[PDB]
């Protein structure tokens, strides 16, 4: 009977913040590489709680949960939880080109610049729904996102993150908030 794996408050957590993986005899593991922090948790919580006092790069990755042991046994593997740690690197800067002032119905081009060499970029709306992108050219450390059409009815507030594609769960501290000023 296939269980469900979630995190609280969520699955994208800043360095040094608390997070608890929950699923509903449990067994939590991480894909591709073992996660020792799981083994140092008391059994009182195991049966379905896995708390992390302050997250770091060590915790980042793709986890699945299940129960039983092939002769009990084997509840189907849960859907993957992708536990992302942000704030590992210095922040990029986000800018609106040509301007953060946009006419209603218009589109605008967002530009995320990391002064640190990274090949992975993420744009998040508020303030979260996030889009992913390679750099705008070969080895540039700059991504370009197209956004809109915009409307004065709603907020259009963004931040961007940078990361290394060999470590896609470890992100740099978000940019400052960029607000679009939409003119009706």
């Amino acid at each position: 009977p296939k269980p469900t794996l979630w995190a609280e408050p969520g699955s994208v957590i800043t360095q040094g913040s608390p997070v608890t993986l929950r699923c509903q005899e449990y067994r939590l593991y991480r894909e591709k590489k073992t996660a020792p922090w799981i083994t140092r948790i008391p059994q009182e919580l195991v049966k379905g709680q896995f708390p992390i006092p302050s997250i770091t790069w060590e915790h980042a990755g793709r986890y699945r949960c299940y129960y039983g042991s092939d002769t009990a046994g084997r509840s189907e593997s849960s859907d993957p939880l992708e536990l992302v740690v942000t704030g590992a690197y210095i922040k990029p800067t986000l800018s609106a080109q040509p301007s953060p002032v946009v006419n209603s119905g218009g589109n605008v081009t967002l530009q995320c610049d990391s002064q640190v060499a990274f090949d992975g970029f993420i744009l998040c709306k508020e303030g979260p729904q996030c889009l992913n992108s390679q750099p705008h050219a070969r080895g540039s450390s700059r991504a370009i996102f197209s956004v809109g059409p915009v409307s004065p009815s709603r907020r259009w507030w963004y931040r961007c993150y940078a990361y290394d594609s060999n470590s896609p769960y470890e992100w740099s501290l978000p940019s400052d908030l960029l607000e679009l000023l939409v003119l009706g």
Binding site: Y29, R30, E31, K32, T34, R64, S69, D70
Partner: protein, 276 residues
């Protein structure tokens, strides 16, 4: 086989805290033999291999002279480059330089090179003819024209094909035991459970020299290129190197996998079978 001598120079400005930190190191192949650090009390080019300690007081006086002269040159280059890119005085900046000579199997000159960087990016490179320059950007084309008119490449060529290879050969002979002989990789495999249906097979190569090596995982003879995690080859600290390659496999299928090791020190390429 082939051999090389290379000298690496780094100069780092330190705003408000006196002169730039200058550091130079010399290598033959993957073995370091000299160094200079401007912050050391010594104030001299120092030996960093046993075979270079055969050189007398004149070597150490002259190399200390020359590397100090280069220190001074790159100190000025920092100021020059700061002007060329209209940068402020707040930040630290870095000039780097590399040059040296490759000899082929025969021990006769094969290649020469001579390049700079500024703040990480390429700046100017001597092209492979040893007679023209590749400017990376425009500002470097200034440097290109001056050095072309002053005949900088020529003399560079005379060192590259002269003193460079000739002293490489002397070092090769003087450090024979270290530089002409190899350490074969010591190899083994480890196994780590990820889950009840997946496991990591890791293939190790240790205590090898030189650094150049290829580690690959196969499944039933097929290369598993896309799924192999390779770490960067790393120094052990005793003149030898280390590397591993890993693959996640289904539990119960490990015997399908073989590790393959190519290295100069091995008479023939090595096949490691998880289950012989």
């Amino acid at each position: 086989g082939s051999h090389s001598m290379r000298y690496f120079f780094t100069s780092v400005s330190r705003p408000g805290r006196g002169e730039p930190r200058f550091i130079a190191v010399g290598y033959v192949d993957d073995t370091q033999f000299v160094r200079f650090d401007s912050d050391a009390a010594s104030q001299r080019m120092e030996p960093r291999a046993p075979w270079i300690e055969q050189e007398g007081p004149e070597y150490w006086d002259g190399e200390t002279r020359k590397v100090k002269a280069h220190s001074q040159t790159h100190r000025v280059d920092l100021g020059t480059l700061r002007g060329y890119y209209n940068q402020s005085e707040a930040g630290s900046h870095t000039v780097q330089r590399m040059y040296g000579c490759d000899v082929g199997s025969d021990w006769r000159f094969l290649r020469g090179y001579h390049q700079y960087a500024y703040d990480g990016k390429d700046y100017i490179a001597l092209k492979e003819d040893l007679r023209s320059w590749t400017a990376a950007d425009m500002a470097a084309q200034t440097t290109k024209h001056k050095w072309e008119a002053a005949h900088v490449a020529e003399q560079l060529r005379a060192y590259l094909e002269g003193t460079c290879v000739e002293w490489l050969r002397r070092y090769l002979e003087n450090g024979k035991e270290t530089l002409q002989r190899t350490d074969a990789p010591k190899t083994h495999m480890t196994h780590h459970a990820v889950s009840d249906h997946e496991a990591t097979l890791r293939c190790w190569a240790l205590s090898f020299y030189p650094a150049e090596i290829t580690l690959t995982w196969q499944r039933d003879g097929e290369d598993q290129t896309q799924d192999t995690e390779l770490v960067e080859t790393r120094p052990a600290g005793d003149g030898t190197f280390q590397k591993w390659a890993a693959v996640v496999v289904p539990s119960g299928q490990e015997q399908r996998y073989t590790c393959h090791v190519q290295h100069e020190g091995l008479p023939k390429p090595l096949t490691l079978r998880w289950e012989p």
